[model samples]
Structure formats: structure tokens, C-alpha cells
Target: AAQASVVANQLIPINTALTLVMMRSEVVTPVGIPAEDIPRLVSMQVNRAVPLGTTLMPDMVKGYAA
Candidate 1:
């Protein structure tokens, strides 16, 4: 969770203007875009910078894991 939070925080700001959707991105919707679309865009950017299995693991668990 923290990783995504941090990544979102840092990324949204850094990539915002370059991306029309995320430029005015908000907290609830940082990318200012549809939830379904975020994954694809994020993957596109991430795959360019990071190799597979390089991301840090999150400390928290997601819904239904509780």
C-alpha cells in the first residue's frame, strides 16, 4: 500500500503535466482518469524504467486479505 501510495504521490506529480489525464490529478483519483485505465498506463511507464520483479513489496495487505 505504501509503495503504491508513495509511487502514486511521486509519480502523479512528476508525470502529471506530461500526461493530460494526470496533470490535474486529485487525491481520490490521482491520475484524474478511469480506474481501469490506470493500470495500463502505469505499466507502460514502469516497464520502460524497471525490469520485471524489481518493485519493492508493500508492507500492507489489500482488501479481503484481512
Candidate 2:
């Protein structure tokens, strides 16, 4: 099977909070994300450095999923 992938727009270092707007791309589109919902997808500190173009998950970042 093809491995799923996600991409980040910027470098999110460990324990840094970020909003979906700060991190671009459809990696977290949520099936059909309306413009307003973008703000709601913000996430808390991440457990690791989320480098540009790296994959991520809710567990990786306190309150986000991809």
C-alpha cells in the first residue's frame, strides 16, 4: 500500500503552539474545511519538531490531526 504523507509549511519546534493558518496546506482539510473552521484547527505544543514537509498526527501535536 502507498504510505500516506503530510506536509508542514514551517518549522514547528518542540513545545510550540501553532494554528492551521500558520501551518499551510490541505494536510488537515477535514474532508471539507470551510474558511472559518481554519481557526478552530489550531494546535497546542507539539511533542517534536515538525519540520517542513514532514508528516504529523494529533498525537504528535497536542490538539491537531492529519
Candidate 3:
């Protein structure tokens, strides 16, 4: 399986944040975040701008506080 990763500095608007502007990365989890703690994507907007190579995580968007 693949993970969501930002290709470029694209706007992750209020909607469509779950499946937009990102490309599946060759690398998977096991980075700063835990491997088993795979975060789910949501349609909610991100709190702020995100740069390239950043993996989409839960706190990344406005869906859940955890």
C-alpha cells in the first residue's frame, strides 16, 4: 500500500483535502510517526499550509484533535 505525500505546494482547500494534491510516496510510515498509527485522510481543511514531502496525518487537518 501507498501513503499520501505532498508533491508540491498546493492548496488543500476546505474540501477535497482527503484526495487532492498529494501523490503516493515510495516510502511508507515508520518516520516520526509510528508505523501502526496510520492516520486517516479527511475532507476537512488543514489548519495551515504544508510543504512538500510531508506525510498527511490526523493533526494535519481539521477533522480530529487527536
Candidate 4:
């Protein structure tokens, strides 16, 4: 499956690569959801799924700064 391939690629730890794959998968060729909903939807998903740690969120930019 195309979506599954995208997810498989995401499991790798490279930020630039993962972001490109995710954007391509979620934005360029969305699997199911509406294109307009991606940003708010992803924000919500991150807020819910990613645990807050040490007064900061886990993101590439934030991780680099920490």
C-alpha cells in the first residue's frame, strides 16, 4: 500500500527525510482525510499523542534547540 510505504519510511530517524515523506503522504497525496484538514488535524494528533516533556514538546526544531 502507498500509505503503508510512507509509514514504513517514517520509522527511520531522519527528520528531513521523514518530513518530506510525511508531507508527500499527508499533503500531496492524502490517503483519506480532506486536504484542508491536515494542519489542524495533525496539530491535534500531536497534542494528544505526544507526551509533553520538560516544558517542551518533541519536535525536530525543538529537539535541536534543547
State how far residue 3 of model 4 sits from its true place (Å): 16
lDDT of 4 at 66: 17
RMSD of each: 13.3, 6.2, 5.5, 11.7
lDDT of 4 by residue, 1-66 (tens): 333111222333233222333322232233333333323333222222222121112342222221
lDDT of 1 by residue, 1-66 (tens): 111211232333211222323322223413223333333343223212222222211221111111
Cα lDDT, model 3, residue 3: 46
Best by TM-score: 2
Report the number of the highest-lDDT candidate.
Answer: 2
The C-alpha local distance difference test score for the whole of candidate 4 amounts to: 0.27
Q: What order do you get sorting by TM-score, best first? A: 2, 3, 4, 1
Please say which candidate is ahead in TM-score: 2 or 3: 2
For all predicted structures, in order, the TM-scores are 0.22, 0.54, 0.41, 0.23
lDDT of 3 by residue, 1-66 (tens): 354333323445444454533433335453332223333443556666656555555566666443
- Tens-digit lDDT track of model 2 for 15-61: 88776645554534332222334455566677789887655555666
**What are the clashing pairs of model 4?**
none
How many angstroms is residue 62 displaced in model 2 relative to the true structure, after the best TM-score fit? 1.3
Q: After superposition, how far is residue 62 of candidate 4 from its true place, in Å?
A: 23
Stretches of model 2 off by over 4 angstroms after superposition: 1-6, 26-38, 63-66
Q: If both were scored by lDDT, which would come out higher, candidate 3 or candidate 4?
A: 3
Q: Report the error of model 1 at residue 32, Å.
A: 0.6
Give the per-residue Cα lDDT of candidate 2 at 26.
50
Cα deviation of 42, candidate 2, in Å: 1.9
